[model samples]
Target: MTSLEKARELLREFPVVDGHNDLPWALREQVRYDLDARDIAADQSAHLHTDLARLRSGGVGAQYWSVYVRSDLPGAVTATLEQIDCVRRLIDRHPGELRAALTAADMEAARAEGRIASLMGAEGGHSIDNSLATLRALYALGVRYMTLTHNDNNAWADSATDEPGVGGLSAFGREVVREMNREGMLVDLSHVAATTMRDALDTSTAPVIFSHSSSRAVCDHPRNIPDDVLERLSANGGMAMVTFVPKFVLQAAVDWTAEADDNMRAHGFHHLDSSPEAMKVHAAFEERVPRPVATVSTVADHLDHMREVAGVDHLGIGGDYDGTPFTPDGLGDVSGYPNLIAELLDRGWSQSDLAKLTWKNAVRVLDAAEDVSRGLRAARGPSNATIEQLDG
Candidate 1:
C-alpha cells in the first residue's frame, strides 16, 4: 500500500486528534481566503501542513485551532478577537465538512457523523484582555483551552522565557485559573515558564494541558517541559502534546552567528517573522539535513522520556504545524502523521498505547478538566452569563 493508504488505514483504526494547530492563521493570513467551500483547499499551499483535503486525508478527527496573539503587535486584543471570529466564520460557513466541538463527546459525535471536529484554544493570556469577563466571553464563544502565557510575561503570568515567578501565580492569575476551571476550559501551560507551570498546576483544580510542548529532557529548550514537570502533569492527569519544531527535536548545538546566517538564508529578510516563505525554507532544510533519521529518533526519545517521567497516559500529539519554522522529516505535514505512527509501531507499541498517544490521552484530560469545571460552576452558581443567556 502507498503511504497515504497506509496512513488512512492507521487513522481509520486509531481516531487521530492533533491537540494543536495554527490553521486559523493560514486562513486569516496566508490564504487570506474563506474556508467555506471545498475548493478553497487549493489555496492552502502557503501553509506547510494543513488544509481541508490534507486533514481529511490524514483522518484527523479533531483539531484545536489556536487563537494566537503576537506579543509585539499593537491592538493585540482586537486582532486576536478578529482571528477568533475568522475561525468561527469558517466553521459556520462549512457546516457540512467542519463542525465546532467543545467537549470530547462532541468530538466523538462529529467524527461519527463524518465531520471534522474543530475546537478553539487561545494561545496567550493577553488574548483575554486580562479580564475575567473576557475569559468568560471566550469560553462562551466555544474556546475550550487557554494557554496562560505565550513567550512573554503578561499582566497575570510570567513565561518560561521570562524571570521565574517570584511566588507563583499572581493574585489575578490564580483567579484566572479558577475562573477557567469554573467555565470548563482547560488551562494550558505550554508556553509558561517552569515556575509558572508549577504554580498554575497547583492553583488549577482541573487537569491542564501542555498544548504543544516537547521534552526538555531531550531538547533543553525553554519552550519544552522538563522531566519533573512531566511527572507533575501525569500526577494531575494532564497531557502533553509533542511539537515537531526542529531545534527542539534535534538540539543542534550552534553559535548565535551560525544561527542568524542560517535563519537569514532559510527565510528572506522580508519574511523574518514566521512568514510562509521562511517556514517552507526551514521545513526543506529539516528534510535534507544530514542525520535526519537521528533527528526523528529524538522525537521518539521525547515520547519515551515522557512515558518514563509522566507515564504514557499523559502524552499525546501536538505538531504546532504552520506556527513553527521547522518540522522533522517524514513528519513534515498533516499528511505525515502516520509516519510517527509507523515509528511507534516499529518500537513495538501496542494498539492501546498508540491510541492513547494519538488522541485518547488528550480526550481524557479534556474530560477531566470539564468535569472539574462543572463541579466548580455548580458550587459557585452562575453569575456572569454570556450574551447567549442574556439574549435568551
Candidate 2:
C-alpha cells in the first residue's frame, strides 16, 4: 500500500494525541466565552484550526487544550479558571465528539467509545501566583500539566524570551517542580530557558514533556529544545512533543519574526507586543508582511532529529493549532496528523514506531508520571513551603 493508505490505517488504531492546542484562548479573543456564537460543531475553517468534523477527519483521539492567559495580564488564576470552564463546557456541548479524560486510562476509554478525549494544560507558572495550593487546585480542576513559564519570567523560573532572574530555577522553582510531581502534574518544558529545562530535568522525579517545542538544532529558536536537553530526556525518562509552529520549525520561517519585529517598531510598539492594545498593530503587521510558509516536511525534520537524539519513546506531537497565527502547509489544523504520519512513513519509519510516535509514547509518559506521583505522594505531604522560605 502507499504511504497515505498505510498512515490512514495506523491513525485509526492509534489516533494522534495532541499535547497542546489553544482553542480556549482563541475563544476568549473571538467571542469572549460566547460558546454559542463560536460553535465548533460545524466548519470553523473561517476562524479556527480545530473543529469537531476536522478533529474526526484528522484522526485526533485526545487533546490537551491549553488553558493559557498572557502572563502579563491580571487575574492569571481567574482567567485560567475561565479557560478550564470553557473546555468543560465545550466537551459537555458535544458529548458524542468530546469526552473529558483525567487519566491515561480515561483517554483509552474515550478512544474505545469513539470519542475525542479532552484534557487541560495550564501553560504558565504565573497561573499559580507562587502558591502550591493554587497548583493543587488546578490539578483538582483536571489541569494535568503546567509549563514553568511563558514568554516572561516569573518570580522563580526563567522564561526563554524574558531576561534571566533566577538563572535557571530558584529554590522555590525546584519546590514548584516537586509540588507538581507530588500532584501528578507533568512539568512542561516549553517556553522555558535551557537552564530551566536542565534544572527541571534534574529536579523533576517524574517524566516531563516539552508539550509544544521543536529542535533548536534544526530551527535555532529559543522556543525550540536544545540538543543537550533533548539528549537528557532519554536518561530522565521524559518526552519532547514536537511542536508545529512554523517559526520554531523552519529557519526561513524564523526570519518572519525579525521582519514582524521591524514592523512593530515602525508602528511604535515592542517587537513582541502581547498585550490587548498591541493586537491590532500585530494583526496589521501580519497583513502588511505575510508570514513565510512552512510545510509538513519542516515538522517531520524536527521529529527525525528529536527521535534520533531523544529516542522514539520520548517523542510526541503538540501541533499548537489555534495557539499560533499560522500553521505549516498541509498541517493547517487538528486534522493534519495523518499528513505528518504519512511524511514519517515516507522517511522509512515503521508502523510500530509511528504508533509510538502518535499515541503510545504519550500514554506511557503519562502513566509513568502517575506511577512516580504515587511514590512521591507517599513520601511527602502537600508542600506548603512558601517562596520566602524556599528561595530567600
Candidate 3:
C-alpha cells in the first residue's frame, strides 16, 4: 500500500484517541452556538486540524473536549461552566455522531457503536473557583480530568508562567487533588509549575496525565516537562501526551534567535525578557515568523526524545489545535494527525508502539480513574455516586 493508503488503513482499523483538544472554544467563539452547528462539520475544512470528517478519516475514536477558560476573562468560573454546557449541548445535538462518555465502558460502547466518545476535561483549575463543591459539580457534569492550572496562577495553584505571588498548590488545592482521587477524577498537570506538578503526582491516588505537554529536555519551554518530571510520571504509571504545539516542540533558544530576533530589533528591544513592551513587540514578531516555530521533523524529534526518556508506553497524542496559532508544519490540524502517525511509522515504531501511543495509554489512565470510582460505588453502594459526593 502507498503511505496514504497505509495510513488510511491503520486509521480505519485502530481505535485512535486524542488526550486533549479545545474544539469547545471554537464552538463558543467561532460557531457562536450553545451546541455546535451541524454545518461546523463542513466549515471546519478551513483549518488543518480537527473536524468531523477529518476525525472520521483519521479514525479518531474518542476525544477529550477541553472546558478551558481563559484567565483574563471576568467571572472565569461562570464562563467555564457555560463552555462545559456548550459541549454537553453539542453532544445532545449530535447524538448519532457523538456521545458524552464518563467511564471507560462508555468510551468502549461509543467506539463499538461507531460513534466518537466525547469526554470532558477542565483545562484550568480556576474553573472550580476554589470551591470543592464546584469541582464536584464539574465531575458530576461528566468532566473526567482537571488540569491544575493554565497559563496563570489560580487562588489554589500556581502556573508555569511568570505570574507572581502564586507558588504551588495551597492547602485547599491539596484537598482538591485528594478529593479528585477519591472521586475517581484524573488530575492533569499540563500547565502547572514544576513544584505544583510534583505535589500533584505525590498526592494523586490514580495515574495522572500531562494532557498537552512536551519534553522540556527537548524544547526548554517552561510549559514542557523535564526528564526528571517524565521519570516521575512513568514511575507513577501516568502518561505524558506529547503536544504538537510548535512553540513547545521547538527549543526556546533556536526559536527565539530565529523568529523573535528580527521583531525585537525592529522594536529596539534586546530580547523577549527585556520588558513588558519588548514582550508585546515579540508577540508581534511571532505573528510574522513565516510559518510557526517548528516543523513535522521537530515534532518527531520531541516524540523520539520523549520515547527515549519516558518509554513508548508513557506517550500519547494531545494536539492543542485551535488553542494556539503555532503548530508543526505538515501536522497543522486534526487532519494532519495521520502524517504524524506515518512519521512515527517511518521512524521504525512498531505497530504495537503506535497502538499504545494512539489510544492504549489514555485508555489505561482512564480505566484507572474509572476503577477507583467503580470501587467507591461498590463499597458505598450506588448512593455514593450522588452529585453531592462529586461536589466535594
Candidate 4:
C-alpha cells in the first residue's frame, strides 16, 4: 500500500487528538462571537483555520480549544471565561460534528458517536488573577488544562520571552503546579522559560505537555522546548506536542520574522500588532522581503527529533491553528494533519508509532492524569494556599 493510503487507514481508527487550537480567540477577533458570520458548521474557508468540515478532513477526533487572552490585557479572567463560553457555544452549535468531552473516555465516546470531542484549555497564567479558587472553578467549567504563562511573565510564573524572575518558579508557581495536579488539569509548558519548564517537571505529579511548542534544538526559539527538557518528559511521563508555527520551526524564517517585527515597529505598530491594517502592511512587506516558508516536511523534522529525544510515548501534535498568524506550507489549517502524517510515514515511521503520535499517546496521558487526580483528591482538599501565604 502507498504511504499516503496507509496514513489514511491509521487515522480512521486512531484519529488525531490535537492538544491546542485557538478557534475561540479567532471568533472574538473576526466576528465578535458572531458564529453565523463564519459558521464553522459550514465551511469557514478563509475566515478560520478550523471548521467542522476541515476538522473531519484532518481526522481531528478531539481538540483542546484554547481560551487564551493576552497576558497584558486587563480583565483577563473575564476575557478568558468568555473564550470558554464561546467554545461551549460552538460545540452546541454543531451537535452533529462536535460534543463536549471532559475525559479520555468522553473523547473516545465522542469519536464513536461520530462527533469531534471539544475540550477547553485556558492559555495564560494571568487568567487566574492570582486566585486558586478561579483555577478550580475553571476545571469545573470543563477547562482541562492551563498554559502556566503566555508571552510575558505573570506574578506567579516567568515566561520564555521575559527576563528570569523568582529564579525558576516562585513559591506560588510551584503551588499552581501542585494545584493543577490535584484538580486533574494538565500543566502546559509551551510558552514558558527553560527554568520554568524544569521547575514544572520537578513539581507536577501528573504528566505535563508542551501544548503548542516545537524543538528549540531544531529552531532555537525561546517558545520551543529545549532538548534537556524534552529528555525529561520520558521520566515525567509528559508529552511535547509539536506546533506548526513557521518561525518556531525554521531558523531562516525566524531571522526574517525578526526583521518583519522591526518593520512593524518601523511602520508605527506594535511588534505584536494584530490590527487589520498592520496585517496588510506586514503582508506587503513580506511581498518585498520574500519570507522563508516552513513546509509539512519541516514540521515532521521537528517530530522526528522530538521522537528521538522524548520517545513516541512522550510526543504528540498541537498545530496552534488560528493562534499564530503564520503557518507552515501544507500545514496551514486544521485540515493539515494528514499532510503531517503522510510526511512521517514517508520517513519510515511504523503504524504503531504514528497511531501513538496521532491519538493513543494523548489519551494515555489524560487517563494517567485522571488516575493521579483520585489519589490527590483523597490525600488533600482543595488548596486554600495563596501566593502571599506561600511565596512570602
Lowest summed lDDT across 10 adjacent residues in model 4 is found at 1-10
The global Cα lDDT (0 to 1) of model 4 is 0.90
- State which candidate has the highest lDDT: 2
Tell me the tens digit of each residue's lDDT in model 2 across 31-81.
998997879998898999989999988989999999999898889999999
What are the root-mean-square deviations of the candidates from the true structure over C-alphas?
A: 5.9, 2.2, 4.7, 1.9
The lDDT-based order of candidates, best leading, equals 2, 4, 3, 1
| Candidate 4 Cα misplacement greater than 4 A, ranges | 263-270, 273-288
Cα lDDT of all candidates, in order?
0.76, 0.92, 0.79, 0.90
Number of clashing residue pairs, candidate 2: 1
- lDDT per residue, candidate 4, 1-392, as tens digits? 77677777789899998999998899999989988998887888777798888988888989999999987767998998899889988988888888999999998898788788889989988999999999999999999999999988888788998898876689999999999999999999998989999999999999999899999999988999989999999999989999999999999998998999999999999987999999998999889999799999999989999999889999899999988888889988898888889989899999899889988899989998999999999998999998889888
Give the per-residue lDDT of model 1 (tens digit) for 214-250.
9887877788998888888766888888888776666
Ranking by TM-score: 4, 2, 3, 1
Each prediction's TM-score versus the true structure: 0.85, 0.95, 0.86, 0.95
Candidate 1: stretches off by over 4 Å: 1-8, 31-40, 46-48, 164-168, 253-295, 381-392
Which lDDT tens digits does candidate 3 get at residues 101-218? 9988888888788899999899988888777777888889888999998988887788997464346776667778877876788999999998888888777778889989998988
Query: Which pairs clash in the backbone of model 2?
Result: 58-335
